[PDB]
């Protein structure tokens, strides 16, 4: 059902934390993923949540400004960080399952300013030499653009507030929280479209 809605695409919400803006050279530090489901009523809602702290890859650059921004101490002994390979492999495992079960044929990343998270995910996958990536190699569902249309807002915090959702700046910029808000935001935009009779055609 989730797969008739988006021509076979299985939407998965993704947020990453990084040690910079350069996907090829800057450390991936954290990643959360939230799969979605469609109920009998045809409404969209979050399904499964995965979250991993990621160890900076060997040779990775780290910008203090980024660390200052996300508050991540890449040296905290009990971060419980895993390898980029480990995080993506575990996420890909869940995504692949959710795909076959719903009739989808490929995953698509839902993310806020999606090019960012997509570039980092693809770079991490490259690093680890992962051959089986369930995510579309270039297409994404950018919630910034989607909110621009739906809410006249492109900033995540502002978009959520405008959508009637709660948003907590003190929790903001953490992978789990941002992913969850982005997931709720995406479901709301889709549900609102259906609500107003935009869907089905």
Shortest distance, CB of residue 78 to a second copy, whole angstroms?
33
- Asked if 20 interacts with Co ion (CB under 5 A), we say no
Residue 190 contact, options Mg ion, a second copy, Co ion, none, Cβ 5-8 Å cut-off depending on partner type: a second copy
Q: In what order do the strands lie in the sheet with 44-53?
A: 44-53, 28-38, 9-18, 106-111, 135-142
- CA-CA-CA-CA torsion for 148, 153, 156, 160, nearest 10 degrees? -110
Asked whether 185 and 143 are in contact (CB, 8 A), the reply is yes
Q: What x-and-dash track marks residues 26-65 binding a second copy by CB under 8 A?
A: ----------------------------------------
Which residues, numbered 141-180, are part of the site for Mg ion (CB under 5 A)? 173, 178
- Asked if 57 interacts with Co ion (CB under 5 A), we say yes
For residue 173, indicate whether it is catalytic. yes
Q: Exposed/middle/buried for 137, CB within 10 Å: 0-12, 13-18, 19+?
A: exposed
- Asked if 98 interacts with Co ion (CB under 5 A), we say no
Q: Tokens 């982005």: give the residue.
A: 182
* Annotated binding-site residue? 47: no
Angle at which helix 143-151 crosses helix 175-195, to 10 degrees, equals 40
Name, in order, each residue with C-beta under 8 angstroms of 3's C-beta and a sequence gap of 6 or more. Answer: 9, 10, 102, 103, 104, 105
- Asked if 26 interacts with Mg ion (CB under 5 A), we say no
* Annotated binding-site residue? 173: yes
Which residues, numbered 125-184, are part of the site for a second copy (CB under 8 A)? 138-142, 144-146, 148-155, 158, 162
Question: Which residue in 108, 183, 104 sits closest to 140, CA to CA?
Answer: 108
Residue 144 contact, options a second copy, Mg ion, Co ion, none, Cβ 5-8 Å cut-off depending on partner type: a second copy
Tell me which residues are annotated as active site. Answer: 173
Q: Which residues bind a second copy (CB under 8 A)?
A: 4-7, 9, 108, 113-116, 118, 138-142, 144-146, 148-155, 158, 162, 189-190, 192-193, 196-201
């Amino acid at each position: 059902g989730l797969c008739d809605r988006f021509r076979g695409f299985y939407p998965v919400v993704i947020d990453v934390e990084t040690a910079g803006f350069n996907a090829k050279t800057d450390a991936l530090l954290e990643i959360a993923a939230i799969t979605l489901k469609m109920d009998e009523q045809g409404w969209l809602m979050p399904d499964t949540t995965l979250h991993f702290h990621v160890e900076p890859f060997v040779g990775a650059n780290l910008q203090p400004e980024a660390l200052a921004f996300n508050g991540i101490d890449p040296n905290d002994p009990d971060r419980g960080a895993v390898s980029g390979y480990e995080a993506l492999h575990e996420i890909f495992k869940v995504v692949r399952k959710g795909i076959k079960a719903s009739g989808c044929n490929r995953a698509i990343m839902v993310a806020h300013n999606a090019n960012f998270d997509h570039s980092f995910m693809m770079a991490a996958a490259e690093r680890a030499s992962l051959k089986r990536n369930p995510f579309h190699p270039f297409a994404t569902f950018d919630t910034a653009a989607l909110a621009g249309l739906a809410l006249g807002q492109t900033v995540l915090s502002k978009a959520c507030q405008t959508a009637g959702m709660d948003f907590d700046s003190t929790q903001a910029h953490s992978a789990l929280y941002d992913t969850e808000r982005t997931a709720v935001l995406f479901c709301e935009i889709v549900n609102r479209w259906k609500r107003l009779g935009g869907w089905p055609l």
